[PDB]
Structure 1
Amino acid sequence: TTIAGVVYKDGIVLGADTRATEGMVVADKNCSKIHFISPNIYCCGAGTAADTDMTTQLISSNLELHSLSTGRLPRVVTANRMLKQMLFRYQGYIGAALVLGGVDVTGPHLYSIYPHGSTDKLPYVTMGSGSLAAMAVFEDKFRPDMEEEEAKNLVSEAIAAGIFNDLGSGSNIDLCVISKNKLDFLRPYTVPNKKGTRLGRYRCEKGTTAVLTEKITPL
């Protein structure tokens, strides 16, 4: 998998692919890996799928309760705190690696969280199996205070390099743009690959299959 995030002059851009495999066989071709946490906070997960799903759902509910009680928009530091404390409590048996990002009354914030409870605050981050192929692109072409479109192009290039150079990544590209005044959730953003057209006609005509028993249950 390949998940990436960048900070530009007004907000955050996050991106991910959509392939999910089981062993060496492609299971899902349209997986979703960008998770809602708060109207201003989002997360991209990698590792074991079930663990990331349950972790994000639990943290989202806790932040919902906290925001209802206080009456204010939540902060990225709060979500980072709860995530890292819960992950450290389990001593690394929850194989979730997370890229967390959001905009609050302090400005854009972007964190990376590891399965053992570590945390980094950085201006651009990548995770997954194809994390090195995208980090190459970020090291080559990153500048501070980019515009929206330049950051979107940069994230697309990083994710495309991860898709094309790694066997565990593929299919489409998803983008999420978080800004102070809006939130864009592009699904999908690019479709680099398409399925070839079938040449033959293998339609099975009626009466090809032999049947032993049959019963009809009228509802």
Structure 2
Amino acid sequence: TTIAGVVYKDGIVLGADTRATEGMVVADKNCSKIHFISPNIYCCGAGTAADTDMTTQLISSNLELHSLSTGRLPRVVTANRMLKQMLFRYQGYIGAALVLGGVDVTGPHLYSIYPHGSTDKLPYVTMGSGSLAAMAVFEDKFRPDMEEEEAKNLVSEAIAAGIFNDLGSGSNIDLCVISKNKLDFLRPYTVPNKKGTRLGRYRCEKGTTAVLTEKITPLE
């Protein structure tokens, strides 16, 4: 898996791949690793998929419960403090490694959260198996106070580096752009890999399969 984030001049850009493995075998191709937390806060997830799903869902519900009492827009510090406080309580048994980012009244914030409850807020973070390839691009090409399309190109380059140099990542690049006045969830953004067109045909015609038993059961 491969996920990344940046902070540009106006807001946040997130990115992720779509491959999901169970061993050295590919199970899913069009997974969705970028999760809803709030209309201004999204999260990317690596590690054990079920843990990330349930954790993000729970914090999403709790923030939709907090923002509805307050009547205000949520903040990223609140989500971070929820997540880290839970993961620290589970002492690492929840394998949820995350890249959280949003935009609130104070401005754009970006965090990386580890399954033991450590947190880092930084202008660019990577996570997963293709972390090193992504950061090899960020360290060479990152600049402060960038534009939207420059940031999007940078993140796409990072995820593509993680794809074409790691075995556990591939098959697409998704993005999410967040700003004070807009949100653009881009699924898919680029399709760098496409299966090959098949030459022969193996369509089995009615009769090639032998049957012993038959039953029909009408409905309406």
Q: TM-score range by the shorter chain?
A: over 0.9
List runs of 5+ in structure 2 lacking aligned partners: none
Deviations 1:7-32 (A, max 9, x none): 00000000000000100110001100
SS in 2 for 1:186: strand
C-alpha separation in 2, matches of 1:218 and 1:110:
56
Partner of 2:168: 168
SS in 2 for 1:65: helix
SS in 2 for 1:169: coil
Partner of 1:66: 66
Sequence identity (%): 100
Deviations 1:20-66 (A, max 9, x none): 01001100011000000000000000000000000000000000111
TM-score (norm 1): 0.99
| Cα drift, residue 210 of structure 1 | 1.1
| Cα drift, residue 209 of structure 1 | 1.1
Partner of 1:155: 155
C-alpha separation in 2, matches of 1:213 and 1:112:
57
Deviations 1:140-196 (A, max 9, x none): 001000001100000000010000000111100000000010000011000001111
Aligned length: 219
| Cα drift, residue 112 of structure 1 | 0.5
C-alpha separation in 1, matches of 2:159 and 2:46:
14
Partner of 2:23: 23
Deviations 1:107-155 (A, max 9, x none): 0000110000000010000000010001000000010000011000000
Deviations 1:73-96 (A, max 9, x none): 010000111011011011110000
* Counterparts of residues 34-113 of structure 1 (less than 5 Å): 34-113=34-113
SS in 2 for 1:165: coil
C-alpha separation in 2, matches of 1:111 and 1:127:
11
Aligned alpha-carbon RMSD (Å): 0.5
| Cα drift, residue 215 of structure 1 | 1.0
C-alpha separation in 1, matches of 2:150 and 2:70:
37
| Cα drift, residue 201 of structure 1 | 1.3
C-alpha separation in 1, matches of 2:112 and 2:204:
52
C-alpha separation in 1, matches of 2:90 and 2:210:
55
